[PDB]
Design a protein around this ligand. Structure first.
Ligand code: GDP
Ligand code: MG
Lengths: 175, 441
């Protein structure tokens, strides 16, 4: 079991990425998708069958009113911005600070530039890595609409988390 | 930018409002939920320690002094109003049906202790404790047991189960006589199981006392050793959980957004909308607590003293229990109202390691509240710091048909949430036009 979060400004596509990864669906409808609490999905990591527990913000990020229970015990946190919206990029530094307070610095973060399919792009892929590198976390450029590197987001994060679990096991020197 | 038209505007994120907001959103309505304060919970919020000093002390200590003595604020989540959850209560039945159990974790409360002649005695949890308790002699326990068998065996629609008693016509004292129960036992059953704050129930009909006694017993049965549950991280988790239910189903949430002006419809007086620093929002009706419409609220006459005490050690004569309720019936002190104590501790991530929170509360009946609570303070031993505060209990003047301003009641001085859920069921009907019937999600 792994509690994974998706955080970022409203409109960046957090709920689409989640729905694409689990259900393999995209809804272009301009509405927010409501009705999503969390999804479950089994991932396979080096033989190990790991269940991801993926929690939606339910729109509470919209006025910075996210519930504490959301953050608690999160092992991985996906920070997301919209490559067509510069403000959603600028605010990542702020989200980073916030998440590191509430997750209590034990969570593995990961930066995602969403809507890489759009031609109305205003943040380059290189800009995104500059910030990712600056913060000490990996980078993926995704599109929930076109399924561009969406799986890679979740596998990359799951893999890092298991790396830390596995290297913290006490060694059976005795037997 | 933001929609300005909603099916319902809800003001203040107390538990009552949050439960309403959630249920309305589940129903398909479009809720907007605003709070002037920078955090969830309203009057029943759990707050950090520094905030506890800011709220109730005249000369707050330095960060540096507080932290060496008590630790960092992130370990503290201190209830402003002491409550527990009846195991088979209605708030938990809502939690289950709405799946908000996903956003909140519960521990059982270790036990319930009752006060007598200046000494606290544990309410028996099983047969072994029953047998060894010195509250009742051998034969009193038998009658008591025959009484409790009746509470279970009683079935409304079968007269042959009633043992010759009518819950409408007979008084509780008359029921107690029937079974042969002496006055100490009456007090026990009345204040410790039925959870009355005075002895008036004795002359009143049995029905309500029966129901409450059946609830106690049913709550002890469900998971075992006691009738109470308590949320990890404090009571503040409860409203936050329902806020999320609401958000999941369509609700919008704004904190730290004071209501600059309420807007009423031209001539009619009814509710139109509100005016915030984030623009202006409209709805055909509003659900709000009393601090948003003081003029549409009247006092109920009662004022409640609430004393929050930090201890360094378990409560005396409690077998080092992690959580605890102490009931001090009024007869034992010459009062009109019981005193209550609720204890929780680091086991519930409400305070830093090693500490205990003891929240004493009662209905004031003198001009010196601090003295009224003294018997309770003696039960606690060495207290590290007391946070005192008085709150007046308001209710709505009208039911909101006139104005579509549907107000909630202030949180009362009872030890659990049964009455709060009574307020929710009520306010729901007033607003919806329909009883609250519970769906599983
Ligand atoms: N073109 C494009 N649009 C997207 C993508 N992901 C989301 N959207 C759209 O952007 C809007 C925001 O969706 P949502 O997942 O609710 O954003 P959220 O606030 O971050 O949860 C919706 O109208 C989506 O259809 C994407 O990868 N490409
Ligand atoms: Mg969303």
């Amino acid at each position: 079991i792994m509690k994974i979060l998706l955080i970022g400004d409203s409109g960046v596509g957090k709920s689409c990425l989640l729905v694409r990864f689990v259900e393999d669906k995209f809804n272009p409808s301009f509405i927010t998708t409501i009705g999503i609490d969390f999804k479950i999905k089994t991932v396979d990591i080096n033989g190990k069958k790991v269940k991801l527990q993926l929690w939606d913000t339910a729109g509470q990020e919209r006025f910075r009113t996210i519930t504490t229970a959301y953050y608690r015990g999160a092992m991985g946190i996906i920070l997301v911005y919209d490559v067509t919206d510069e403000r959603t990029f600028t605010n990542i530094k702020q989200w980073f600070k916030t998440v590191n307070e509430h997750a209590n610095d034990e969570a593995q973060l990961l930066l995602v530039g969403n809507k890489s399919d759009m031609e109305t792009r205003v943040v380059t892929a290189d800009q995104g890595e500059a910030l990712a590198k600056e913060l000490g976390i990996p980078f993926i450029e995704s599109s929930a609409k076109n399924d561009d590197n969406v799986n890679e987001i979740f596998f990359t994060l799951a893999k890092l988390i298991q790396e830390k679990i596995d290297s913290n096991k006490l060694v059976g020197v005795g037997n | 930018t933001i929609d300005t038209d909603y099916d319902v505007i809800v003001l203040g994120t107390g538990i009552t409002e949050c439960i309403l907001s959630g249920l309305l959103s589940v129903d398909g309505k479009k809720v907007l939920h605003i709070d002037k304060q920078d955090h969830y919970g309203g009057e029943a919020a759990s707050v950090t320690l520094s905030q506890l000093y800011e709220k109730f002390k005249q000369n707050p200590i330095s960060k540096e002094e507080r932290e060496s003595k008590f630790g960092k604020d992130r370990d503290w989540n201190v209830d402003l109003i002491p409550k527990f959850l009846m195991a088979n209560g209605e708030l938990t039945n809502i939690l289950i049906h709405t799946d908000v159990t996903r956003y909140v974790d519960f521990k059982q409360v270790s036990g319930s202790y009752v006060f007598k002649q200046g000494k606290i005695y544990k309410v028996p949890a099983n047969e072994i404790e029953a047998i060894s308790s010195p509250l009742m002699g051998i034969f009193e326990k038998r009658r008591m047991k025959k009484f409790l068998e009746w509470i279970s065996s009683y079935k409304e629609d079968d007269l042959s189960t009633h043992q010759g008693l009518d819950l409408d016509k007979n008084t509780m004292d008359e029921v107690y006589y029937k079974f042969g129960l002496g006055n100490s036992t009456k007090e026990f059953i009345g204040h410790a199981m039925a959870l009355w704050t005075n002895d008036d129930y004795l002359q009143q009909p049995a029905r309500p006392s029966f129901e409450r006694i059946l609830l106690y017993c049913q709550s002890v049965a469900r998971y075992g050793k006691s009738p109470y549950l308590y949320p990890m991280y404090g009571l503040g988790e409860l409203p936050q959980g329902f806020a999320r239910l609401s958000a999941i189903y369509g609700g919008t949430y704004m904190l730290d957004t004071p209501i600059d002006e309420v807007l009423y419809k031209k001539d009619t007086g009814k509710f139109e909308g509100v005016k915030t620093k984030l623009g202006t929002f409209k709805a055909p009706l509003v659900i709000a607590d009393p601090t948003y419409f003081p003029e549409k609220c009247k006092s109920t006459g009662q004022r409640v003293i609430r004393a929050i005490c930090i201890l360094n050690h378990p409560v005396p004569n409690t077998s080092n229990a992690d959580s605890l309720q102490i009931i001090i019936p009024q007869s034992q002190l010459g009062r009109k109202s019981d005193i209550y104590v609720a204890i929780v501790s680091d086991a519930h991530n409400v305070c830093s390691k090693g500490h205990y929170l003891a929240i004493i509360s009662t209905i004031i009946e003198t001009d010196k509240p601090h003295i009224e609570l003294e018997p309770a303070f003696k039960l606690l031993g060495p207290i590290e710091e007391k946070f005192m505060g008085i709150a007046e209990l308001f209710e709505p003047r009208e039911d909101g048909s006139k104005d579509n301003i549907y107000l909630s009641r202030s949180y009362d001085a009872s030890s659990h949430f049964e009455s709060m859920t009574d307020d929710v069921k009520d306010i729901y009907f007033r607003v919806t036009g329909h009883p609250l019937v519970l769906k599983q999600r």
